[PDB]
Design a protein around this ligand. Structure first.
Ligand SMILES: [Mg+2]
Ligand SMILES: [Mg+2]
Ligand SMILES: [Mg+2]
Ligand SMILES: [Mg+2]
Ligand SMILES: [Mg+2]
Ligand SMILES: [Mg+2]
Ligand SMILES: [Mg+2]
Ligand SMILES: [Mg+2]
Ligand SMILES: [Mg+2]
Ligand SMILES: [Mg+2]
Ligand SMILES: [Mg+2]
Ligand SMILES: [Mg+2]
Ligand SMILES: [Mg+2]
Ligand SMILES: [Mg+2]
Ligand SMILES: [Mg+2]
Ligand SMILES: [Mg+2]
Ligand SMILES: [Mg+2]
Ligand SMILES: [Mg+2]
Ligand SMILES: [Mg+2]
Ligand SMILES: [Mg+2]
Ligand SMILES: [Mg+2]
Ligand SMILES: [Mg+2]
Ligand SMILES: [Mg+2]
Ligand SMILES: [Mg+2]
Ligand SMILES: [Mg+2]
Ligand SMILES: [Mg+2]
Lengths: 62, 63, 153, 402
RNA sequence: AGAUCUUGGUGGUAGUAGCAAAUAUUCAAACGAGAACUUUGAAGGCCGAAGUGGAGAAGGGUUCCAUGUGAACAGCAGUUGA
RNA sequence: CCCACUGUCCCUACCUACUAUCCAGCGAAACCACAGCCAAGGGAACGGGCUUGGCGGAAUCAGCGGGGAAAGAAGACCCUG
RNA sequence: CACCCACUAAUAGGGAACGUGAGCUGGGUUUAGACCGUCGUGAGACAGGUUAGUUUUACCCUACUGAUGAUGUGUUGUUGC
């Protein structure tokens, strides 16, 4: 019912889920789960992981 | 019944280890009567005792 | 031979005896106390159940360290076990007594174990080794067994 | 010599018989103090721990940082089908305590209720109360019952009613119901006896016993942890790694004198499965359960004033290790002792709720229903299919279905 | 009655401690009264040539080999065996 | 002493293998005046026994290390001969 | 023991065989190796300094922690005080 969030994978994050990460430079990110956060922490590109929303829209899937 | 002697004799005559010696489980009775190397040779000729092929180690991956 | 507790009527009774039976004596004693007073068929099926761990014998006197099992609640006891070797030995003795009862020509459908006795047999010496080159006895504890059956129904 | 530094004692001396509960239900041991001026009402109930989830609500606590703000609070769902009352017990006050005076059971005892009387229902002849209930019919037994009621009315000081849960309504394997004495309060002995006499053979829904946003007590048996050492059973300090004969121990279990071990020394043994009583638990939402008036209604279980989503309290995939909840459920705030599918007793608070923690109106805005069998990420099947679109098995099923 | 006495016998402890150094056994069959342990076959493994292989010295002295037994021993068992 | 490193620690938790656990079989050893609930008293000046009092309910299991001034050596310190 | 740093409402003093080694550790003292200084002719000594140096056993009774039970109510169960 509050603000819905978007993760590294582009999923909606419901309240009470995931974590919020803010870097020192001044950008704040949120991740749906530890998998998405870990993928972000290795600086893996979202567009090359098959189940990310970004890959889905890039490849015109569905 | 207990064919350790027969296995030893077969391994010695066939000049291979006991690993490669195959004794026929069906004619166990016939083998157990053989207590001489001549009898072992006869059983070899008849085909009750088989020298099993060497385990395969191919070098195709190596090549 | 001089059986202890000779029967009241040594015509309706048969005897079986064993000596130097290579079984644990305490286990045998607990088993014999367990089967005391039973009909022969009931005793036989009971020992067979002991073999299959379906009925446990109550360890009443020599219960040191004996664990707890559910089947002990049949008796007013808590500790119990399933001595296989004791069961087999008592089975052989019981079949011997049955053969004697046949030879006396009295039906074996009416036998009740009125008397049974287990006594320690002479100990046999075995040897072990300890930490500082010390030797400890490794004794065995066989037992002599006698029993008397009786026709009653 | 004194210990060189002071340290608070580890463990509580109020729970010293740290042993398994001799009961599986969890008994009341203290009912709310009676007062005749109140209306006739029950005092307690039986519930089952379905599972847990979290909710989103706005707090209306003035003067805090959380006033007019939205918070997330974890909740516990307790499935509570309506109790079935089968009997009445009256007690008489003695200088030796309360003792049972006279007991009356109702006719047509439910089959599940009768199972409680049998350790092995399978081989039973089902004879329980069969001769008893026949006295509800002949005039002699009826007169005996009327004399019994008159005696209770003129002699008993407090009375209770026996209610049993309904196993057929729950998704658990066990079909043996749970019996309970529930005290009845709020009126004269005659009034409460008349009310209970009306309520014999009847169903008492949980809403008629407890109310919205009211703080109650929770009684149950915790999670049995099995045999445990001192370190977990008492949270004492671990010994250093150089320790020889064991580091998960207590180094000193008592001085030379009094030449014994005091009871207050922490020692290994049973952990968990302890009968506990928790108090001050607010009821955020009392569920309504499943109805079919024309069709099955599930929105009533999870749709709130701002969600308006036709979804049930059951999370995606059902509750972990529990099943699916279809009947009346209670949404407590916070944690509740015992595992899943563990019977719980809920009781009216013995105290007076004057604090602004209590008596605060509760308005839910959003209730999470994501799958807890993993990291759930969709509220409903409908939203999941909407997001993910068609799938391969969906396509092949459409192919065969044309 | 003593002498931490000598010799010998026997208890409680106690059916207790214990039978945990070196990855692992399974199926079927046969003999056999009796099979987890005997033997054969199949399977999975291990030792991995500085070996759990093949042979010698010193030392041991018949343990070597055949057949037979299930008294004792191989701390379980064994139809097997130094 | 410093850089890095980390469950040494904050502050503990989980997992694996073998044990312990139970069963089958086999099966000792140390030790043992007799036995083994405590408080106070007196006493060889710190009792399991005695007095006073508190009390006391068969058989046992898994732990445990407070006590038995536990066991292991006729104290190796000191003194005498 | 002492002292300092910091925090805190406060950083009070003590006992239980100078509590607590079959709970741990072994840093110290208090063996055998060794060096320095002092003493002694010397072997050797030094509540003088330094360094390195095996911390055994519980399965018994009891205590304590848990676990079966056990006594009567004819049996057995349910609900309770
Ligand atoms: Mg013991
Ligand atoms: Mg043990
Ligand atoms: Mg040894
Ligand atoms: Mg030696
Ligand atoms: Mg150490
Ligand atoms: Mg989950
Ligand atoms: Mg004498
Ligand atoms: Mg004398
Ligand atoms: Mg002597
Ligand atoms: Mg053992
Ligand atoms: Mg072992
Ligand atoms: Mg290999
Ligand atoms: Mg070699
Ligand atoms: Mg030989
Ligand atoms: Mg053996
Ligand atoms: Mg005393
Ligand atoms: Mg001396
Ligand atoms: Mg001396
Ligand atoms: Mg103090
Ligand atoms: Mg001290
Ligand atoms: Mg000590
Ligand atoms: Mg020590
Ligand atoms: Mg030191
Ligand atoms: Mg020195
Ligand atoms: Mg000099
Ligand atoms: Mg060194």
């Amino acid at each position: 019912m509050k603000v819905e969030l978007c993760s590294f994978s582009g999923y909606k994050i419901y309240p009470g889920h995931g974590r919020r990460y803010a870097r020192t430079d001044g950008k704040v990110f949120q991740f749906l789960n530890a998998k998405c956060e870990s993928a972000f922490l290795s600086k893996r590109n979202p567009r090359q992981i098959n189940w990310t929303v970004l890959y889905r829209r890039k490849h015109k899937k569905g | 019944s207990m064919l350790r002697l027969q296995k030893r004799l077969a391994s010695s005559v066939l000049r291979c280890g006991k690993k490669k010696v195959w004794l026929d489980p069906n004619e166990t009775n016939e083998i157990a009567n053989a207590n001489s190397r001549q009898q072992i040779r006869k059983l070899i000729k008849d085909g009750l005792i088989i020298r099993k092929p060497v385990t395969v180690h191919s070098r195709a991956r190596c090549r | 031979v001089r059986y202890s507790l000779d029967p009241e009527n040594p015509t309706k009774s048969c005897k079986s005896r064993g000596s130097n039976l290579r079984v644990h004596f305490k286990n045998t004693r607990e088993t014999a106390q367990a089967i005391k007073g039973m009909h022969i068929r009931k005793a036989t099926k009971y020992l067979k159940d002991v073999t299959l761990q379906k009925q446990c014998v109550p360890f009443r006197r020599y219960n040191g360290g004996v664990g707890r099992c559910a089947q002990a609640k049949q008796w007013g006891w808590t500790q119990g076990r399933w001595p296989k070797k004791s069961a087999e030995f008592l089975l052989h003795m019981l079949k011997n007594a049955e053969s004697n009862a046949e030879l006396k020509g009295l039906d074996v459908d009416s036998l009740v174990i009125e008397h049974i006795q287990v006594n320690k047999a002479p100990k046999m010496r075995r040897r072990t080794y300890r930490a500082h080159g010390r030797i400890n006895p490794y004794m065995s504890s066989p037992c002599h067994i006698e029993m008397i059956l009786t026709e009653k129904e | 010599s004194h210990r060189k530094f002071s340290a608070p004692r580890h463990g509580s001396l109020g729970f010293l018989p740290r042993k398994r509960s001799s009961r599986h239900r969890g008994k009341v041991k203290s009912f709310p103090k009676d007062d005749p001026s109140k209306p006739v009402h029950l005092t307690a109930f039986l519930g089952y721990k379905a599972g847990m989830t979290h909710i989103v609500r706005e707090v209306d606590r003035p003067g805090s940082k959380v006033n007019k703000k939205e918070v997330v609070e974890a909740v516990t769902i307790v499935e509570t089908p309506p109790m079935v009352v089968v009997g009445i017990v009256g007690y008489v006050e003695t200088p030796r305590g309360l003792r049972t005076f006279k007991t009356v059971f109702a006719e047509h005892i439910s089959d599940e209720c009768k199972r409680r009387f049998y350790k092995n229902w399978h081989k039973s002849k089902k004879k329980a109360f069969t001769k008893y209930c026949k006295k509800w019919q002949d005039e002699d037994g009826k007169k005996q019952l009327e004399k019994d009621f008159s005696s209770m009315k003129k002699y008993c000081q407090v009375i209770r009613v026996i209610a049993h849960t309904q196993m057929r309504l729950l998704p658990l394997r066990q079909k043996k119901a749970h019996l309970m004495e529930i005290q009845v309060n709020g009126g004269t002995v005659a009034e409460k006896l008349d009310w209970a006499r009306e309520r014999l053979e009847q169903q008492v829904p949980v809403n008629q016993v407890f109310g919205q946003d009211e703080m109650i007590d929770v009684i149950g048996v915790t999670k049995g942890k099995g045999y445990k050492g001192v370190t977990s059973r008492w949270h004492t300090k671990k010994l250093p790694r150089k320790t020889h004969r064991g580091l998960r121990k207590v180094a000193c279990i008592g001085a030379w004198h009094p030449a014994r071990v005091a009871f207050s020394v922490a020692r290994a043994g049973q952990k968990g499965y302890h009968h506990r009583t928790e108090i001050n638990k607010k009821i955020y939402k009392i569920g309504q359960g499943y109805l079919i008036k024309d069709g099955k209604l599930i929105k009533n279980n999870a749709s709130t004033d701002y969600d308006l989503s036709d979804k049930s309290i059951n999370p995606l995939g059902g509750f972990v290790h529990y099943g699916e909840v279809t009947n009346d459920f209670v949404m407590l705030k916070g944690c509740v002792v015992g595992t899943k599918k563990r019977v719980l007793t809920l009781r009216k608070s013995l105290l007076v709720q004057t604090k602004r923690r209590a008596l605060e109106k509760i308005d839910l805005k959003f209730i999470d229903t994501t799958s807890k069998f993993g990291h759930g990420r969709f509220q409903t099947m409908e939203e999941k299919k909407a997001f993910m679109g068609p799938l391969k098995k969906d396509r092949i099923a459409k192919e065969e279905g044309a």
